[PDB]
Structure formats: C-alpha cells, structure tokens
C-alpha cells in the first residue's frame, strides 16, 4: 500500500530526476525484453542453428 | 525507447554498406622505377606514394 506513496515522495519532487529516471528505466526495460524474446527464440527451435550442423568444417 | 529506435535506424542507414566493406583489403603488384624517381600505382581505392 504505502510503497506507492514512499516511491513518489522519493522520486517525484523535482523534474530533472524524473527525466533521468525515465531514460534509465527505458534502457533497462528495453534490455530485459530483448533478453526474454531471445530466450524464447532459442527455446522454440533447437537443432536448427548455424552451429548445430554436424559437418560445418569438413569440406576440405 | 521507440524514438531511440527510429533515430538510430535512420542514422545508421547512411553508413557504408556490405558491398563496400567487402572490398577493403588486398595485395597487388607494382613495377620497377629509377633511383630517386616514382611511378604511382593503384589499389582498392587509394594510390601509393
């Protein structure tokens, strides 16, 4: 309950802090969603990658 | 986040392309020249002093 009001009193008394907070949060969330979608990507299709072919160095 | 995406995509669209970066290293041949003189030669895109 009081987490909202405490966080407000900490981070939303000025504006420059607000803008910095928005920029940093955007950075972190962007990277997190990148990581998540990548993980789903390799989960869905195993054995199809580039380095999962057995003979990729045996044409000499 | 979306504004950053669009700005970066548009600004990096103007950088050197894969075709140009493919031709960026090699070795070629010169000819003989007299002592103290010079005949300029050619390479990928740059002459040779």
């Amino acid at each position: 309950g009081g987490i909202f009001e405490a966080l407000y009193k900490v981070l939303m008394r000025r504006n420059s802090v607000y803008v910095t907070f928005v920029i940093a949060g955007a950075f972190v969330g962007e990277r997190a969603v990148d990581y998540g979608v990548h993980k789903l990507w390799e989960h869905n299709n195993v054995g199809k990658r580039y380095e999962d072919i057995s003979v990729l160095g045996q044409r000499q | 986040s979306l504004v950053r995406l669009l700005i970066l995509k548009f600004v990096l669209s103007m950088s050197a392309s894969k075709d140009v970066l493919a031709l960026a290293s090699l070795e070629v041949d010169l000819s003989s020249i007299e002592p103290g003189t010079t005949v300029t030669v050619k390479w990928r895109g740059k002459p040779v002093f």
């Binding site: 000025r14 420059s16 802090v17 910095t20 920029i23 950075f27 | -």
Partner: peptide
C-alpha cells in the same frame, strides 16, 4: 536564491548526460 538554481542546473546536466549515454552506448569510453 543561487543555491537552488545551481543545484537544479547541475541535476539537469546530469539528465542531459544520461540521455546522451542512452542514445549512444559506447563501452570504449
């Protein structure tokens, strides 16, 4: 009157620097 203004200017500079390091992400610097 000066202290509040100069502190706000410094914090706005911090915000501008953070925005710059968001748009560009150089680990070589």
């Amino acid at each position: 009157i000066q202290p509040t203004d100069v502190k706000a200017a410094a914090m706005w500079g911090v915000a501008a620097a953070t925005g710059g390091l968001y748009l560009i992400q150089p680990w070589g610097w």
